[PDB]
């Protein structure tokens, strides 16, 4: 995996979270999950659109 927020901090996780526009209304574990999903949305190639 490219992301390892699971080790990061709740402050950095939620900070970067809002930075992505996703959110933080969840939790650290859920933050790393949503983040990992956020970065994975590009699969290391290119982002996508909600269509």
UniProtKB/Swiss-Prot annotation:
The chain holds residues 2 to 50 of 218 of the full protein. The lineage of its organism: Eukaryota, Fungi, Dikarya, Ascomycota, Saccharomycotina. Interacts with SUB2 in the presence of RNA; this interaction facilitates RNA binding of SUB2. Keywords: Phosphoprotein. This is Protein THO1. The modification Phosphoserine is found at residue 23. Present with 6580 molecules/cell in log phase SD medium. Belongs to the SAP domain-containing ribonucleoprotein family. GO terms for cellular component: nucleus. It comes from Saccharomyces cerevisiae (strain ATCC 204508 / S288c) (Baker's yeast). GO terms for molecular function: chromatin binding; double-stranded DNA binding; RNA binding. The keyword Oxidoreductase does not apply. It comes from the Eukaryota. One of its GO terms (biological process) is protein-RNA complex assembly. Residues 5-39 form the SAP domain. Facilitates RNA binding of SUB2 and likely plays a role in mRNA export. Suppressor of the transcriptional defect of HPR1 by overexpression.
């Amino acid at each position: 995996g490219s992301a390892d927020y699971s080790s990061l901090t709740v402050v950095q996780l939620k900070d970067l979270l809002t930075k992505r526009n996703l959110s933080v209304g969840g939790l650290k574990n859920e933050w790393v999950q949503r983040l990992i999903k956020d970065d994975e949305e590009s699969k290391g190639e290119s982002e996508v659109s909600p269509q």
